[PDB]
Amino acid sequence: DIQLTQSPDSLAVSLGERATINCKSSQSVLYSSINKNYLAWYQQKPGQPPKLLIYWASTRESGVPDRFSGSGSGTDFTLTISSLQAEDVAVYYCQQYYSTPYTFGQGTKVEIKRTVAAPSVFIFPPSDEQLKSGTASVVCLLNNFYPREAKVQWKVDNALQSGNSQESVTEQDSKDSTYSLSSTLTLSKADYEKHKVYACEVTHQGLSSPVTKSFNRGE
Template identity: 40%
Template structure:
């Protein structure tokens, strides 16, 4: 799900009179990381001061988890929505605001959006604007992760003899206990002759300890598999390969 439902609601609440939305920008960091139990702050900066209603600055914070609709956490800068845990607090004024999460839990891993409200008054017209930041992804891990990135453990599983008899071969690489979540898996295939294959990757899953697991699957015809000498699964972060796990074809069941 996206922020479409909120955007539709805000469109209904706003009065547009031809003024460009580009006049107001809301800036957030793309990502932050935190250990479980630690305190993390997410900053939000607006290009113009937000509207003040009474003594309250009109800025809200939303949380969106994968596959779910956004949920409002904070409104009027520091007022918690009903049912939101006390570990979520908001602060700030004018154009600088902060969402603070004290005692971060693994379940707090999500994307956080700030939403600002502006009253633009010129000589010709008055317009009201709700503007969203681009969102900040919070990644949560265990304390020891923050001594450095946690290198995932790799395991490569070859095709079964039953599958080979059906004319196909599937090789899976399982990556466990990695942090943060921006690791990627790739394959190297060493063999003779022309070999073609397809790759696919599962979604990243965060475990209860805050670390991440995922997998990549290599699929190829059985006759191509018989030309393979070895396959190697590599875990990379950015341009650096930091873990690899080979599998020799002759170690696997034969058709």
């Protein structure tokens, strides 16, 4: 059997330069009678079935742009997209077919790098209908931020919590490549009426200081 690895696992470069990915295998993938390496390179935009680009590791399938290229030998192979565009964001894959079985790598994600931007920090409590429901859900929003990394933390009556927050991140934005992150905290009504003050703290490389948003229940 053959195992495959990809490098790097995550990647992000700006618009208009070369993007390089590496695929490394174990056994030689050069056939005996035919001197052509047995590798294929796939792409997959989110929400769509995968669509091949490179077959036999050195050719270009019909109907694809010519701004793509590949190289490599032995057990290590390289893929280079020249002058990546805004519509080339996807998840790429390498797969050998020397013999049964074939196996892909873990996967690589491509993102468009740019300058840091000032984000927006919001926080919202629930309402009367949710109180009547029986639970209490308070949601902290962080909007139009960059880079992806940003720490969102809670504070209930100046006390930490564990195993109570669920964090969700949206995909890229077509307008200016901005993201939104939500941290939702759910708790019981009995615990809701036993606690008064809630606070959200946001830490990001684009913030001079961590941002605190605190308020007492009902105010």
